[PDB]
Nucleic acid binder design. Structure first.
Length: 184
RNA sequence: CUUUUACUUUGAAAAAAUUAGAGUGUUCAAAGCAGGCGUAUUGCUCGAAUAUAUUAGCAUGGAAUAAUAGAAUAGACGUU
């Protein structure tokens, strides 16, 4: 098939990932049916505190729909087909600098194309099935900076455990300090 | 080709008399621009200041304060 479902050209970790995708449409019917056209960019490993990895997907963009359609299954077959591993879903979003003064016009920025936006989206798609409820942020005497993130108290089992990892994955990408809370 | 301002530094350019002020015994002082010594038998000299003198304008170092300007139907450098 699979090099296909890679969306670049190169490639070491991806082709096993492509393989395990072209394996579920091979093995599971119900699963080809949705999965067949769902293309991706590249992957990035990222380490977490207690030994345990985390499997960093990056999305073309459009299907974030496609992908959300069958995530809450897809991951579960993948977490088994890869160990330790945390598989995630997030999009690659064309951030931009602010126009300086000697700068330029180009055309704009389209708000949602700004550092915080993207960082808000990075949110929605670090968790996903839970839905964000409530945000909160700290400011400590060493200008800390800490987001509390508020969660809904329903489906946090989809995955809890993750969590220890989540904090990290939102750290390499950004250089930040993230926490959660289950409210009662 | 080098946005612009105010503000501030200095510095000059600046009329003396006045005003402040150094000298100096008009006998003192108010003054004044004088006086001082010798071989006072025939020649020597010290000076006659500084400073204030603002408001406008120049030249000037400051770059805090307070304004203002560059680029959001697109500009900035350019090796092509």
């Amino acid at each position: 098939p699979q090099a296909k479902i890679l969306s670049q050209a190169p490639t070491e970790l991806e082709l096993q990932v492509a393989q395990a995708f072209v394996e579920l449409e091979n093995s599971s019917p119900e699963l080809k049916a949705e999965l067949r056209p769902l293309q991706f960019k590249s992957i990035r490993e990222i380490d977490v505190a207690g030994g345990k990895k985390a499997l960093a997907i990056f999305v073309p963009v459009p299907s974030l729909a496609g992908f959300h359609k069958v995530q809450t299954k897809l991951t579960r077959e993948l977490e088994k087909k890869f160990q330790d591993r945390h598989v995630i879903f997030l999009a690659e979003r064309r951030i931009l600098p602010k126009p300086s003064r000697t700068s330029r016009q180009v055309q704009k920025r389209p708000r949602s194309r700004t550092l915080t936006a993207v960082h808000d989206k990075i949110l929605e798609d670090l968790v996903f099935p839970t839905e964000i409820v409530g945000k909160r942020v700290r400011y400590l005497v060493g200008g800390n900076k800490i987001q509390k993130v508020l969660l809904d108290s329903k489906d946090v089992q989809q995955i809890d455990y993750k969590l220890e990892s989540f904090q990290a994955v939102y750290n390499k990408l950004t250089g930040k300090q993230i926490v959660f809370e289950i409210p009662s």
